[PDB]
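Q: Could you write out the predicted structure for this multi-component system? I'm mainly interested in how the pieces pack against one another.
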Amino acid sequence: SYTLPSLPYAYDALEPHFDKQTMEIHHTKHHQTYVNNANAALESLPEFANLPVEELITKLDQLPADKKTVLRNNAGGHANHSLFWKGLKKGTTLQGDLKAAIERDFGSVDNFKAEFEKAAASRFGSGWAWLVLKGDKLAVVSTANQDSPLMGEAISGASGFPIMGLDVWEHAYYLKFQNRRPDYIKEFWNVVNWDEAAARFAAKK
Amino acid sequence: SYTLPSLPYAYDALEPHFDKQTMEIHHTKHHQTYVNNANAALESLPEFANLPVEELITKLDQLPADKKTVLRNNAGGHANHSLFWKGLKKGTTLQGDLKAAIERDFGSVDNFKAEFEKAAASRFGSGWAWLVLKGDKLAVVSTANQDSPLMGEAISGASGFPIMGLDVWEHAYYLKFQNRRPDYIKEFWNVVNWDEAAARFAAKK
Ligand SMILES: [Mn+2]
Ligand SMILES: [Mn+2]
């Protein structure tokens, strides 16, 4: 039984970058729905229901053929948004090991940002832009809908351990930005939680 | 080169069903961008640039590998939205041979509406819900992002001649309905142009 996590901050804690109205709807309506549908799909699968959502999405091919898609979509949605909320915070600073790794793997922070922005803006339709750790190297990848790199290349077209990510489904930015996804992407730099990103980069698991 | 077609009515002609602000943005920003992106990719393809968009999406497999996805997405977007605007109109009535065909193929108008509503709601992520004519029979199907049944089954996962369609990308309904897509789908019944659908059904292609 998956529980919708509470946000680690107020709905307007990311203002003036991400709007409070969207933060509320995004959490209480969209995430709520993924949790509901994932839970409904796992009702007849107690063997899989006890696994953490992050582990479940790595075992999608282990599910009954008729449960793969519904759980890929909703367990993926739950896993992705849970990471999203924790990966957002104002006032942090990229530094330490993670900053060194980005400069090492991308040449510079600006280099990395340009590549991330490209992935985020070029994601056609619904999806996510990610900064992942593929073994020893950091990389920028994107996925469609609620797919996660944790699902593997065969399913998601991407792979690696997510360090941080940006939701580019239109519901994530339409109320305030409408079609202006690039403005939303720029604002993201102001709220991406480098402290949590650093924590994940340290864990690597 | 492609050009953004003018709407067949004022931006507020679909009120109180589809909001005027969305009609404006959807047309002048979203549709415009597909036209812009398609033209940019076709600049270097004089042998394809002269083709009507509806014809171009039937030959995506003929394009250079590096041009297939960008044109599938943008030429698809242009073709889809062009159909969409003409497929909307207030005050129409589903009747004639189209209605009889719907009743024959789905058992009843209400049965058809339920199936269309289901397909429209079940399209996960960005996409379209379609009423298509194939094998001389009407059927409900959905496609991802800007894919069209006219692109064929291999690419779009669907086939047939579109009679009418509903855009379920979040930008099409978020301003007024937010996450409540089913409500948006219900309102669609109030603006779906049965006259144009009937004309398309008559022509058969
Ligand atoms: Mn989201
Ligand atoms: Mn659209």
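A: Regarding packing and overall arrangement: Chain A touches chain B through 19 residues (CB under 8 Å).
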